[PDB]
């Protein structure tokens, strides 16, 4: 969308992540699998929810319709009565019809953010202790086991624990060592 996460560099969503809207997938020497960012799907749900309730609560100050009666020689103020009531049902139909249309655009772009802003969160945590593979997916210099993963997942990774481990790998892909 506007933020370019959905249908973007992340090249489609994963079917296999059934339990939530956004999340992680990983591979290590231990294993492999999917894990929904429940936390941040919940902040999504709560906002998309306020939205539908925001609408409803606005739409009971809608024009209340009761009916009136006219004989055969008041014909033209019978028309006035109809040109009015149609008139309004157009004003409110347009309003419901467009407000749905405009909060559809916003919702889909809201998601497209939530994802980008998740990618970037991880990116700032792991810095140069991983590679930006550039398809939505990072890959670690230092080995990262299942406990380590939870850290990145739940957002309490710590760089400094793995720097030495990492800048041995970084050090050596750069074949500096290769001068023996």
């Amino acid at each position: 969308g506007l933020f370019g996460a959905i249908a973007g560099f992340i090249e489609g969503g994963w079917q296999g992540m059934v339990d939530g809207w956004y999340g992680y997938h990983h591979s290590n020497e231990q294993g492999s699998g999917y894990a929904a960012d429940k936390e941040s799907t919940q902040k999504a749900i709560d906002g998309v929810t306020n939205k539908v309730n925001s609408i409803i609560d606005k739409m009971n100050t809608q024009f209340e319709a009761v009916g009136r009666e006219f004989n055969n020689l008041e014909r033209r103020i019978e028309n006035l009565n109809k040109k009015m009531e149609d008139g309004f049902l157009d004003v409110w139909t347009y309003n419901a019809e467009l407000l749905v249309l405009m909060e559809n655009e916003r919702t889909l772009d809201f998601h497209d953010s939530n994802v980008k802003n998740l990618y970037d969160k991880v990116r700032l945590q792991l810095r140069d202790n991983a590679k930006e593979l550039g398809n939505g997916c990072f890959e670690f210099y230092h080995k990262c086991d299942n406990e380590c993963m939870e850290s990145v997942r739940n957002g309490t990774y710590d760089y400094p624990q793995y720097s030495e481990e990492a800048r041995l790998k970084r050090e050596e892909i750069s074949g500096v060592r290769s001068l023996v």
Partner: single-chain antibody
Amino acid sequence: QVQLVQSGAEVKKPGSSVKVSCTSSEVTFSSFAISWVRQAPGQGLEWLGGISPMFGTPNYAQKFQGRVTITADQSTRTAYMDLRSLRSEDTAVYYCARSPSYICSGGTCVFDHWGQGTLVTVSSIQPGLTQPPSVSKGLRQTATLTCTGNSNNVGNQGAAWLQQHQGHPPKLLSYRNNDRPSGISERFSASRSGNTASLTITGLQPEDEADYYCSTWDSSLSAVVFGGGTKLTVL
């Protein structure tokens, strides 16, 4: 304002199977997880399971792994329980219960709104938290109810309380962070201490004597657990 309306009180032979249905009042039906939580006659509460209506994926208790099957129709905004192979143990009143979180899989899965009740009987018990069975303190005194657990539940996830008068379904006195819903009076404050959660009721009144249950997520069982119960008596 929400209204969970459960179904009629079917009564059945052994081996047979039941399909109770809770049907929700509200338009944002999918966004809130629904759990099912039987109460056998006289005893306390037991979670069978629960579902995220929006995602579909459900969570069951070790005990019902193979037997129960719960799901919910988004179109009709109603949730269902297919319990199977039922003997006499399985006789109880069966509540559905609204969670303020979207899926039922963790400490945030507490039960703020409950249905009216569905007594299933069958023609011919074990708590997960520790709760004194009785507490008796005098009119207008102040009370302290305690629920203890360990690291896989009250330790990490924290606990949530519940009041139950004879006959009625329970209702929520506090959330996991012990912030109180609008409903509840200010003399019902709850807090927690490591692995021992405590609700203090001040200015005791006739009103207050009924049951009290604490509840949490236990991450060693993937399940919702309740204390045995505790009858408060004003005196």
